[PDB]
Amino acid sequence: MEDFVRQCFNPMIVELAEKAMKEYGEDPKIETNKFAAICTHLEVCFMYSDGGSKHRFEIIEGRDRIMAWTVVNSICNTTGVEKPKFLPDLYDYKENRFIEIGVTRREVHIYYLEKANKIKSEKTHIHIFSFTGEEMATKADYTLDEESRARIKTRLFTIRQEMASRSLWDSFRQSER
């Protein structure tokens, strides 16, 4: 699985994921499923940010915490939007709202609900993807066009297929709590 992550995700994603894990005192070489999940989430966030017009999205995920909150507080002051309690993943300049992105190995509806409980904010939009082509977004509002969304769902299915081929998928699918 460590070989898999290092060959399927670009080095910038891998580096961010290793750092996030070490910040919690986890070793990427041991908790390899968490490692893979962090990388996949990061890639989806970056893919989503590329899905719109140039300048449609500001990326918040993948930033150190000081810069992430600088970006968030800046947007709240520039736009007057409510300040979230937790860092979201992106801000949408077209829709004027923060987005929380979820990627789940279980079922989208359960993950949407968990996310909606934790976020517990009216303001933040939630968009969940599975590795088997399912998605679920706030007010059935999917933000991006179908072509962009299909390219994300396809990348996730491809990662699922690659893990499967290495007999990694079963352990990975079962590691999400």
Ligand SMILES: O=C(N/N=C/c1cc(O)c(O)c(O)c1)c1cc(O)c(O)c(O)c1
């Ligand atoms: O919950 C998330 N990450 N991990 C939290 C976490 C908390 C712990 O106490 C651990 O021991 C751990 O391994 C991970 C998580 C999930 C997302 O979709 C995000 O966008 C995000 O910023 C964080």
Ligand SMILES: [Mn+2]
């Ligand atoms: Mn995030």
Ligand SMILES: [Mn+2]
């Ligand atoms: Mn997220």
